[PDB]
Design an enzyme around this catalytic site. Structure first.
Site, PDB file in Angstrom:
ATOM      1  N   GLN A   1     -10.288  -4.400  -0.980  1.00  0.00           N
ATOM      2  CA  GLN A   1      -9.636  -5.022  -2.151  1.00  0.00           C
ATOM      3  C   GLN A   1     -10.645  -5.236  -3.259  1.00  0.00           C
ATOM      4  OE1 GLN A   1      -6.413  -6.168  -2.268  1.00  0.00           O
ATOM      5  NE2 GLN A   1      -5.841  -6.219  -0.099  1.00  0.00           N
TER       6      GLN A   1
ATOM      7  N   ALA B   1       1.587  -3.289   3.221  1.00  0.00           N
ATOM      8  CA  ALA B   1       1.869  -4.693   3.449  1.00  0.00           C
ATOM      9  C   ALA B   1       1.446  -5.452   2.180  1.00  0.00           C
ATOM     10  CB  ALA B   1       1.121  -5.214   4.677  1.00  0.00           C
TER      11      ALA B   1
ATOM     12  N   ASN C   1       5.363  -9.422   7.079  1.00  0.00           N
ATOM     13  CA  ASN C   1       4.278  -8.514   7.425  1.00  0.00           C
ATOM     14  C   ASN C   1       4.093  -8.614   8.932  1.00  0.00           C
ATOM     15  OD1 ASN C   1       1.970  -6.909   7.606  1.00  0.00           O
ATOM     16  ND2 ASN C   1       0.658  -8.453   6.692  1.00  0.00           N
TER      17      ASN C   1
ATOM     18  N   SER D   1       0.788  -1.239   0.000  1.00  0.00           N
ATOM     19  CA  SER D   1       0.000   0.000   0.000  1.00  0.00           C
ATOM     20  C   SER D   1       0.819   1.289   0.000  1.00  0.00           C
ATOM     21  CB  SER D   1      -0.969   0.047   1.123  1.00  0.00           C
ATOM     22  OG  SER D   1      -1.953  -0.883   0.840  1.00  0.00           O
TER      23      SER D   1
ATOM     24  N   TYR E   1     -10.944   3.259   3.808  1.00  0.00           N
ATOM     25  CA  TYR E   1      -9.684   2.949   3.176  1.00  0.00           C
ATOM     26  C   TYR E   1      -9.839   1.749   2.217  1.00  0.00           C
ATOM     27  CZ  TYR E   1      -4.873   1.838   2.471  1.00  0.00           C
ATOM     28  OH  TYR E   1      -3.683   1.606   1.921  1.00  0.00           O
TER      29      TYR E   1
HETATM   30  C1  LIG Z   1      -2.030  -2.067   1.597  1.00  0.00           C
HETATM   31  O1  LIG Z   1      -1.011  -2.405   2.129  1.00  0.00           O
HETATM   32  C2  LIG Z   1      -3.187  -2.989   1.470  1.00  0.00           C
HETATM   33  N1  LIG Z   1      -2.747  -4.136   0.661  1.00  0.00           N
HETATM   34  C3  LIG Z   1      -1.797  -4.076  -0.247  1.00  0.00           C
HETATM   35  O2  LIG Z   1      -1.257  -3.061  -0.602  1.00  0.00           O
HETATM   36  C4  LIG Z   1      -1.358  -5.312  -0.999  1.00  0.00           C
HETATM   37  C5  LIG Z   1      -1.939  -6.572  -0.492  1.00  0.00           C
HETATM   38  C6  LIG Z   1      -2.089  -7.197   0.731  1.00  0.00           C
HETATM   39  C7  LIG Z   1      -2.694  -8.427   0.558  1.00  0.00           C
HETATM   40  C8  LIG Z   1      -2.941  -8.772  -0.773  1.00  0.00           C
HETATM   41  S1  LIG Z   1      -2.400  -7.513  -1.845  1.00  0.00           S
HETATM   42  O3  LIG Z   1      -4.347  -2.320   0.970  1.00  0.00           O
HETATM   43  C9  LIG Z   1      -4.514  -2.470  -0.458  1.00  0.00           C
HETATM   44  C10 LIG Z   1      -3.363  -3.603   2.834  1.00  0.00           C
HETATM   45  N2  LIG Z   1      -4.153  -4.783   2.710  1.00  0.00           N
HETATM   46  C11 LIG Z   1      -4.648  -5.461   3.687  1.00  0.00           C
HETATM   47  C12 LIG Z   1      -5.339  -6.713   3.295  1.00  0.00           C
HETATM   48  O4  LIG Z   1      -4.856  -7.765   3.671  1.00  0.00           O
HETATM   49  O5  LIG Z   1      -6.374  -6.711   2.566  1.00  0.00           O
HETATM   50  C13 LIG Z   1      -4.623  -4.998   5.050  1.00  0.00           C
HETATM   51  C14 LIG Z   1      -5.150  -5.733   6.063  1.00  0.00           C
HETATM   52  C15 LIG Z   1      -4.103  -3.595   5.354  1.00  0.00           C
HETATM   53  S2  LIG Z   1      -4.173  -2.507   3.949  1.00  0.00           S
END
Ligand SMILES: *C(=O)[C@](NC(=O)Cc1cccs1)(OC)[C@@H]1N=C(C(=O)O)C(=C)CS1
Length: 358
Positions: free
Chosen positions: A117, A315, A340, A61, A147
């Site tokens: 997502q 992450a 992570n 992110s 978010y």
């Molecule tokens: C940002 O870090 C987040 N995810 C990503 O950038 C990339 C991914 C993480 C898991 C699969 S792709 O938002 C897009 C974080 N994602 C998650 C999540 O697991 O859906 C979080 C719990 C924090 S935000």
């Protein structure tokens, strides 16, 4: 003097690695226009490949900062406006809920509840269209901040359409190249495969998987050096010779919305400095950071405030990243790890370091 830097960094990061069982980590501290680098551990455990200043980490992110700035640059170029309706760029988005949703809303998670997502079942552009068409908001546009990688992701893809370039081409030619981020990638080329760390999740070596709007929301892999340069470019945009890029960086730190003590930028999030450390550390926990909150519009947006803590967590399944910086103090940090681990541990470590150096 640099001894202050070494002492606080070592005292701070070595326990963190031990507590969180981080296999590999790279840290940069930017102090008065100079970077200071620290690495530990392994980029690849099985092969005993050490973390180095050329090791690539998944930003997750934190990529959204690049997306925010690339959008800011398209605004400066006059290719798009944040006031424009989404439908101006994707006229196939005809469902009634899209009436009133602007590019600003997408860029700032305020469209009305687009999800964290894009669903894993979306594999094609027709699947994507169907997803956004069927999506049901929970709130009116411009009223709650939730978010969402599916919100800023869409913004990214729309924002480059007038340029005629792909999202990767736009980002490489308009952001990476001008700032001389030559070890920063959306797709890692063969020459860099040897430097691309593995992520570790429950002990298995992992890399991020392809996904819909991945380039836009979580595309970027970078080194500690390039990230320190990204921080510097964002701390001091007036040193950037490319006018639209300079302006874009400034637009991404404009304050658009306020919730509690936080202000939403394009990608970046901002608080006034000095901050309450408990507020940013606890605020970083996903229980809080991913919750829907009412926002107040900042009408018109406040330009980038120098006395800000400007930051973003990130992450992937295998990686944990953090960038913070304080423009007024010419001070920032980058923490890249190939596990992570919880955001509050990142933020607590960062605050301990930057507060010491202020
Ligand atoms: C940002 O870090 C987040 N995810 C990503 O950038 C990339 C991914 C993480 C898991 C699969 S792709 O938002 C897009 C974080 N994602 C998650 C999540 O697991 O859906 C979080 C719990 C924090 S935000």
């Amino acid at each position: 003097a640099p001894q202050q830097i070494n002492d606080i960094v070592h005292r701070t990061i070595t326990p963190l690695i031990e507590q969180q069982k981080i296999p590999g980590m790279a840290v940069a501290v930017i102090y008065q226009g100079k970077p200071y680098y620290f690495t530990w551990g392994y980029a690849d455990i099985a092969k005993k490949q050490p973390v180095t200043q050329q090791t690539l980490f998944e930003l997750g992110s934190v990529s959204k900062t690049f997306t925010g700035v690339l959008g800011g640059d398209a605004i400066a170029r006059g290719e798009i406006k944040l006031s424009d309706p989404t439908t101006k760029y994707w006229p196939e988005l005809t469902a009634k809920q899209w009436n009133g949703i602007t590019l600003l809303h997408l860029a700032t998670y305020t469209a009305g509840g687009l999800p964290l997502q894009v669903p894993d079942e979306v594999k094609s552009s027709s699947d994507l269209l169907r997803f956004y068409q069927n999506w049901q908001p929970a709130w009116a546009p411009g009223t709650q901040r939730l978010y969402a990688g599916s919100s800023i992701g869409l913004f990214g893809a729309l924002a480059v359409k007038p340029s005629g370039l792909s999202f990767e081409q736009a980002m490489q030619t308009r952001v990476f190249q001008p700032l001389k981020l030559n070890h920063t990638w959306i797709n890692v080329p063969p020459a860099e495969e040897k430097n691309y760390a593995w992520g570790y999740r429950e002990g298995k070596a992992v890399h991020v998987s392809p996904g819909a709007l991945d380039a836009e929301a979580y595309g970027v892999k970078s080194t500690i050096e390039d990230m320190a340069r990204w921080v510097q470019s964002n701390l001091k945009p007036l040193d950037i010779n490319e006018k639209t890029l300079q302006q874009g960086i400034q637009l991404a730190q404009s304050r658009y919305w306020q919730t509690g003590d936080m202000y939403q930028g394009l990608g970046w999030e901002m608080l006034d400095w000095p901050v309450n450390p408990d507020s940013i550390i606890n605020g970083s926990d996903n229980k809080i950071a991913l919750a829907a909150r009412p926002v107040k519009a900042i009408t018109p947006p406040t330009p980038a405030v120098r006395a800000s803590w400007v930051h973003k967590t990130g992450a992937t399944g295998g990686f944990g990243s953090y960038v913070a910086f304080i423009p007024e103090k010419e001070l920032g940090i980058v923490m890249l790890a190939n596990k992570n681990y919880p955001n509050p541990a990142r933020v607590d470590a960062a605050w301990q370091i930057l507060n010491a150096l202020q």
